[PDB]
Amino acid sequence: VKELLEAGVHFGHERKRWNPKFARYIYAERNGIHIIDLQKTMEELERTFRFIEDLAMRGGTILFVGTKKQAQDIVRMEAERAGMPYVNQRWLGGMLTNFKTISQRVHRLEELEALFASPEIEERPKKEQVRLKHELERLQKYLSGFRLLKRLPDAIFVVDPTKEAIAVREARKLFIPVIALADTDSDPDLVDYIIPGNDDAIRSIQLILSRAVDLIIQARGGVVEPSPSYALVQE
RNA sequence: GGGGAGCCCUAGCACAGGUGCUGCAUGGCCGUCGUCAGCUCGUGCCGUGAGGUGUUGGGUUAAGUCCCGCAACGAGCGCAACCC
Protein backbone atom coordinates (compact mmCIF):
# COMPACT_ATOMS: atom_id res chain seq x y z
CA VAL A 1 0.00 0.00 0.00
CA LYS A 2 0.95 3.65 -0.52
CA GLU A 3 4.67 4.46 -0.91
CA LEU A 4 5.66 0.88 -1.75
CA LEU A 5 3.11 0.69 -4.56
CA GLU A 6 5.15 3.41 -6.21
CA ALA A 7 8.49 1.62 -5.80
CA GLY A 8 6.78 -0.93 -8.04
CA VAL A 9 6.00 0.81 -11.33
CA HIS A 10 5.70 4.61 -10.96
CA PHE A 11 7.77 7.61 -9.85
CA GLY A 12 9.32 10.79 -11.29
CA HIS A 13 9.53 12.18 -14.82
CA GLU A 14 10.70 15.00 -17.19
CA ARG A 15 13.31 15.49 -19.94
CA LYS A 16 13.79 18.86 -18.26
CA ARG A 17 10.56 20.29 -19.68
CA TRP A 18 9.91 21.16 -16.07
CA ASN A 19 9.03 23.93 -13.65
CA PRO A 20 11.12 25.48 -10.82
CA LYS A 21 8.64 25.48 -7.91
CA PHE A 22 7.85 21.81 -8.61
CA ALA A 23 11.59 21.28 -8.17
CA ARG A 24 11.22 22.18 -4.49
CA TYR A 25 9.08 19.06 -4.43
CA ILE A 26 11.93 17.37 -6.32
CA TYR A 27 14.55 14.98 -5.01
CA ALA A 28 17.56 14.86 -7.38
CA GLU A 29 17.53 14.95 -11.22
CA ARG A 30 19.49 12.03 -12.63
CA ASN A 31 19.04 9.99 -15.82
CA GLY A 32 17.91 13.40 -17.02
CA ILE A 33 14.68 12.26 -15.39
CA HIS A 34 13.81 14.20 -12.18
CA ILE A 35 13.63 12.09 -8.97
CA ILE A 36 10.17 12.68 -7.50
CA ASP A 37 9.69 12.94 -3.72
CA LEU A 38 6.79 10.53 -3.18
CA GLN A 39 6.98 10.95 0.61
CA LYS A 40 5.72 14.51 0.98
CA THR A 41 3.57 13.50 -1.97
CA MET A 42 1.97 11.06 0.48
CA GLU A 43 1.42 14.08 2.75
CA GLU A 44 -0.32 15.85 -0.13
CA LEU A 45 -2.36 12.71 -0.83
CA GLU A 46 -3.43 12.78 2.83
CA ARG A 47 -4.94 16.30 2.67
CA THR A 48 -6.28 15.60 -0.84
CA PHE A 49 -8.25 12.52 0.08
CA ARG A 50 -9.47 14.26 3.23
CA PHE A 51 -11.34 16.82 1.15
CA ILE A 52 -12.16 14.04 -1.36
CA GLU A 53 -14.18 12.03 1.15
CA ASP A 54 -15.59 15.23 2.68
CA LEU A 55 -17.15 16.86 -0.38
CA ALA A 56 -18.01 13.45 -1.85
CA MET A 57 -20.00 12.27 1.19
CA ARG A 58 -21.73 15.66 1.27
CA GLY A 59 -22.26 15.43 -2.49
CA GLY A 60 -21.18 17.59 -5.43
CA THR A 61 -19.40 16.50 -8.65
CA ILE A 62 -15.59 16.30 -9.22
CA LEU A 63 -14.90 16.79 -12.75
CA PHE A 64 -12.96 14.02 -14.33
CA VAL A 65 -10.73 15.63 -16.75
CA GLY A 66 -8.70 13.02 -18.53
CA THR A 67 -7.77 13.73 -22.14
CA LYS A 68 -4.51 12.12 -23.23
CA LYS A 69 -5.68 8.87 -24.89
CA GLN A 70 -4.03 6.51 -22.37
CA ALA A 71 -5.37 8.16 -19.22
CA GLN A 72 -8.58 9.07 -21.02
CA ASP A 73 -9.53 5.49 -21.87
CA ILE A 74 -8.94 4.07 -18.41
CA VAL A 75 -10.40 7.07 -16.64
CA ARG A 76 -13.52 6.94 -18.77
CA MET A 77 -14.53 3.56 -17.40
CA GLU A 78 -13.35 4.62 -13.94
CA ALA A 79 -15.36 7.80 -14.42
CA GLU A 80 -18.50 5.76 -15.18
CA ARG A 81 -17.87 4.08 -11.82
CA ALA A 82 -16.81 7.26 -10.02
CA GLY A 83 -20.32 8.62 -10.68
CA MET A 84 -18.84 12.06 -11.32
CA PRO A 85 -19.61 13.98 -14.50
CA TYR A 86 -16.50 13.58 -16.60
CA VAL A 87 -14.28 14.96 -19.37
CA ASN A 88 -13.69 12.07 -21.76
CA GLN A 89 -12.36 13.22 -25.15
CA ARG A 90 -10.71 16.49 -26.18
CA TRP A 91 -11.58 19.26 -23.73
CA LEU A 92 -13.29 22.09 -25.61
CA GLY A 93 -13.66 25.75 -24.75
CA GLY A 94 -17.03 26.51 -23.18
CA MET A 95 -17.90 23.76 -20.71
CA LEU A 96 -16.49 25.47 -17.68
CA THR A 97 -17.92 29.06 -17.93
CA ASN A 98 -20.59 28.93 -20.67
CA PHE A 99 -22.56 26.58 -18.44
CA LYS A 100 -26.03 27.52 -19.68
CA THR A 101 -24.93 27.18 -23.31
CA ILE A 102 -23.59 23.73 -22.47
CA SER A 103 -26.96 22.80 -20.98
CA GLN A 104 -28.40 23.86 -24.34
CA ARG A 105 -25.95 21.68 -26.29
CA VAL A 106 -27.02 18.82 -24.07
CA HIS A 107 -30.67 19.67 -24.80
CA ARG A 108 -30.11 19.44 -28.56
CA LEU A 109 -28.34 16.07 -28.08
CA GLU A 110 -30.70 14.63 -25.44
CA GLU A 111 -33.70 15.64 -27.54
CA LEU A 112 -32.04 14.03 -30.53
CA GLU A 113 -32.07 10.92 -28.31
CA ALA A 114 -35.70 11.49 -27.37
CA LEU A 115 -36.63 11.89 -31.04
CA PHE A 116 -34.39 9.09 -32.30
CA ALA A 117 -36.91 6.50 -31.10
CA SER A 118 -40.04 8.42 -32.12
CA PRO A 119 -42.36 8.29 -35.15
CA GLU A 120 -39.32 9.95 -36.80
CA ILE A 121 -38.02 6.38 -37.24
CA GLU A 122 -40.79 6.32 -39.81
CA GLU A 123 -41.00 9.82 -41.28
CA ARG A 124 -38.49 12.60 -42.01
CA PRO A 125 -36.39 13.09 -45.20
CA LYS A 126 -33.16 11.18 -45.90
CA LYS A 127 -30.51 13.95 -45.81
CA GLU A 128 -32.04 15.44 -42.65
CA GLN A 129 -32.21 12.12 -40.78
CA VAL A 130 -28.85 10.69 -41.88
CA ARG A 131 -26.98 13.93 -41.13
CA LEU A 132 -28.75 14.07 -37.79
CA LYS A 133 -27.45 10.54 -37.13
CA HIS A 134 -23.91 11.75 -37.78
CA GLU A 135 -24.03 14.82 -35.52
CA LEU A 136 -26.01 12.93 -32.86
CA GLU A 137 -23.15 10.40 -32.81
CA ARG A 138 -20.42 13.02 -32.51
CA LEU A 139 -22.42 15.00 -29.94
CA GLN A 140 -22.50 11.94 -27.71
CA LYS A 141 -18.89 11.23 -28.74
CA TYR A 142 -17.91 14.30 -26.75
CA LEU A 143 -20.64 14.97 -24.19
CA SER A 144 -20.91 11.51 -22.64
CA GLY A 145 -19.87 12.08 -19.04
CA PHE A 146 -20.72 15.73 -19.41
CA ARG A 147 -24.33 14.79 -20.22
CA LEU A 148 -24.85 14.42 -16.44
CA LEU A 149 -23.57 17.74 -15.05
CA LYS A 150 -26.39 20.04 -13.94
CA ARG A 151 -25.50 22.44 -11.05
CA LEU A 152 -22.41 24.21 -9.63
CA PRO A 153 -19.55 21.65 -9.64
CA ASP A 154 -17.37 21.88 -6.53
CA ALA A 155 -13.80 20.54 -7.23
CA ILE A 156 -12.30 18.88 -10.18
CA PHE A 157 -10.20 15.89 -10.40
CA VAL A 158 -8.29 16.16 -13.65
CA VAL A 159 -4.95 14.63 -14.88
CA ASP A 160 -1.78 16.53 -16.14
CA PRO A 161 -2.94 20.10 -15.59
CA THR A 162 -1.03 21.94 -18.30
CA LYS A 163 -3.15 20.86 -21.22
CA GLU A 164 -5.50 20.15 -18.42
CA ALA A 165 -4.58 23.74 -17.45
CA ILE A 166 -6.58 24.62 -20.55
CA ALA A 167 -8.89 22.99 -18.08
CA VAL A 168 -7.28 24.60 -15.00
CA ARG A 169 -7.28 27.99 -16.73
CA GLU A 170 -11.03 27.82 -16.88
CA ALA A 171 -11.94 26.44 -13.43
CA ARG A 172 -9.11 28.47 -11.87
CA LYS A 173 -10.69 31.70 -12.95
CA LEU A 174 -14.02 30.19 -11.78
CA PHE A 175 -13.25 30.38 -7.98
CA ILE A 176 -13.48 26.58 -7.93
CA PRO A 177 -11.37 23.93 -6.12
CA VAL A 178 -9.34 22.11 -8.67
CA ILE A 179 -7.60 18.92 -7.89
CA ALA A 180 -5.76 17.57 -10.90
CA LEU A 181 -2.44 15.36 -11.28
CA ALA A 182 1.07 15.47 -13.03
CA ASP A 183 4.90 15.19 -13.30
CA THR A 184 7.46 17.92 -12.53
CA ASP A 185 6.23 19.37 -15.83
CA SER A 186 3.28 21.42 -14.57
CA ASP A 187 3.09 24.02 -11.78
CA PRO A 188 2.13 23.64 -8.07
CA ASP A 189 0.50 27.02 -7.39
CA LEU A 190 -1.21 26.64 -10.79
CA VAL A 191 -3.58 24.38 -8.86
CA ASP A 192 -5.70 24.34 -5.70
CA TYR A 193 -4.61 20.84 -4.71
CA ILE A 194 -1.64 18.88 -5.91
CA ILE A 195 -0.85 15.30 -6.79
CA PRO A 196 2.84 15.36 -7.70
CA GLY A 197 3.21 12.17 -9.75
CA ASN A 198 4.04 10.95 -13.27
CA ASP A 199 1.07 10.47 -15.62
CA ASP A 200 2.62 8.94 -18.75
CA ALA A 201 2.65 5.63 -16.90
CA ILE A 202 -0.69 3.93 -17.54
CA ARG A 203 -0.27 1.86 -14.34
CA SER A 204 0.20 5.02 -12.24
CA ILE A 205 -3.05 6.35 -13.70
CA GLN A 206 -4.80 3.10 -12.82
CA LEU A 207 -3.50 2.98 -9.24
CA ILE A 208 -3.85 6.57 -7.99
CA LEU A 209 -7.15 6.95 -9.79
CA SER A 210 -8.68 3.77 -8.43
CA ARG A 211 -7.47 5.02 -5.03
CA ALA A 212 -9.46 8.21 -5.51
CA VAL A 213 -12.60 6.59 -6.97
CA ASP A 214 -12.60 4.09 -4.12
CA LEU A 215 -12.07 7.05 -1.79
CA ILE A 216 -15.34 8.60 -3.02
CA ILE A 217 -17.23 5.28 -3.05
CA GLN A 218 -16.06 4.94 0.57
CA ALA A 219 -17.21 8.50 1.24
CA ARG A 220 -20.64 6.98 0.68
CA GLY A 221 -19.65 3.64 2.23
CA GLY A 222 -18.47 0.64 0.23
CA VAL A 223 -15.75 0.18 -2.45
CA VAL A 224 -15.92 -2.53 -5.13
CA GLU A 225 -13.28 -3.09 -7.83
CA PRO A 226 -12.21 -1.65 -11.25
CA SER A 227 -12.61 -3.35 -14.62
CA PRO A 228 -10.25 -1.16 -16.67
CA SER A 229 -6.61 -1.71 -15.69
CA TYR A 230 -3.36 -3.58 -16.42
CA ALA A 231 -4.88 -4.90 -19.68
CA LEU A 232 -4.11 -2.49 -22.52
CA VAL A 233 -1.54 -0.97 -20.16
CA GLN A 234 1.14 -3.42 -21.29
CA GLU A 235 -0.35 -5.38 -24.19
C1' G B 1 -93.90 81.55 -75.97
C1' G B 2 -89.38 81.02 -73.56
C1' G B 3 -86.40 78.88 -70.26
C1' G B 4 -83.05 73.74 -68.74
C1' A B 5 -78.75 70.11 -69.55
C1' G B 6 -75.48 67.50 -72.63
C1' C B 7 -73.13 68.03 -77.09
C1' C B 8 -70.14 71.15 -81.39
C1' C B 9 -68.02 76.16 -83.16
C1' U B 10 -65.44 80.89 -82.88
C1' A B 11 -61.86 85.42 -80.46
C1' G B 12 -60.54 85.45 -75.45
C1' C B 13 -58.46 82.94 -70.57
C1' A B 14 -56.36 78.80 -66.96
C1' C B 15 -54.22 75.67 -69.45
C1' A B 16 -51.65 71.66 -72.29
C1' G B 17 -47.34 69.33 -75.19
C1' G B 18 -41.44 67.77 -75.60
C1' U B 19 -38.32 60.88 -78.76
C1' G B 20 -35.28 68.79 -76.23
C1' C B 21 -30.97 68.83 -72.56
C1' U B 22 -28.77 66.50 -68.11
C1' G B 23 -28.73 58.49 -64.87
C1' C B 24 -23.06 63.58 -61.22
C1' A B 25 -30.65 63.64 -59.27
C1' U B 26 -32.67 59.08 -59.08
C1' G B 27 -36.44 54.61 -58.50
C1' G B 28 -36.93 50.25 -61.16
C1' C B 29 -34.96 46.25 -64.70
C1' C B 30 -30.48 44.77 -64.81
C1' G B 31 -25.06 44.49 -67.27
C1' U B 32 -20.92 43.20 -63.60
C1' C B 33 -16.78 40.84 -60.48
C1' G B 34 -19.70 35.56 -60.32
C1' U B 35 -22.31 30.24 -58.49
C1' C B 36 -17.29 34.26 -56.64
C1' A B 37 -17.78 31.67 -51.51
C1' G B 38 -18.60 34.53 -49.05
C1' C B 39 -21.21 38.05 -45.66
C1' U B 40 -22.62 38.03 -40.13
C1' C B 41 -25.01 37.10 -35.21
C1' G B 42 -25.12 34.59 -29.62
C1' U B 43 -22.40 33.62 -25.07
C1' G B 44 -17.46 32.62 -22.96
C1' C B 45 -12.46 33.97 -23.35
C1' C B 46 -8.87 37.59 -25.33
C1' G B 47 -6.64 43.09 -25.57
C1' U B 48 -6.33 49.39 -21.44
C1' G B 49 -8.67 49.81 -26.16
C1' A B 50 -9.48 49.84 -31.70
C1' G B 51 -10.42 45.20 -32.26
C1' G B 52 -9.41 39.86 -31.94
C1' U B 53 -11.49 34.94 -31.39
C1' G B 54 -14.84 32.08 -34.20
C1' U B 55 -13.33 31.30 -40.07
C1' U B 56 -5.70 31.65 -37.72
C1' G B 57 -3.17 24.61 -38.77
C1' G B 58 -4.29 19.82 -42.31
C1' G B 59 -6.80 17.28 -45.71
C1' U B 60 -11.19 17.06 -48.64
C1' U B 61 -15.12 18.55 -51.78
C1' A B 62 -18.75 21.85 -56.48
C1' A B 63 -18.27 25.27 -52.23
C1' G B 64 -16.73 28.23 -45.45
C1' U B 65 -18.96 20.89 -47.99
C1' C B 66 -17.53 17.76 -44.50
C1' C B 67 -13.72 15.81 -41.20
C1' C B 68 -8.57 16.08 -37.37
C1' G B 69 -6.72 20.37 -35.08
C1' C B 70 -8.06 25.07 -32.16
C1' A B 71 -10.19 29.27 -26.77
C1' A B 72 -14.64 27.75 -28.27
C1' C B 73 -19.25 26.21 -29.51
C1' G B 74 -23.20 26.77 -32.38
C1' A B 75 -27.08 29.76 -35.32
C1' G B 76 -27.93 32.83 -39.34
C1' C B 77 -28.77 35.30 -45.47
C1' G B 78 -26.22 32.38 -49.31
C1' C B 79 -23.89 26.95 -50.09
C1' A B 80 -27.35 22.64 -49.76
C1' A B 81 -31.89 20.40 -49.69
C1' C B 82 -37.31 22.32 -50.38
C1' C B 83 -40.87 23.52 -56.98
C1' C B 84 -40.74 21.61 -61.52
Curated annotation (Swiss-Prot):
A GO CC annotation given for this chain: cytosolic small ribosomal subunit
SUPFAM superfamilies: Ribosomal protein S2 (SSF52313)
Keyword 4Fe-4S: no
Stretches assigned to coiled coil: 98-143
Pfam families, per the entry: Ribosomal_S2
Annotated GO MF terms: rRNA binding; structural constituent of ribosome
Gene Ontology terms: biological process: translation
Keywords: Coiled coil, Ribonucleoprotein, Ribosomal protein, RNA-binding, rRNA-binding
Subunit structure, as described in the record: Part of the 30S ribosomal subunit. Contacts protein S8.
Family: Belongs to the universal ribosomal protein uS2 family.
Protein's job: Spans the head-body hinge region of the 30S subunit. Is loosely associated with the 30S subunit.
Protein's recorded name: Small ribosomal subunit protein uS2
Species of origin: Thermus thermophilus (strain ATCC BAA-163 / DSM 7039 / HB27)
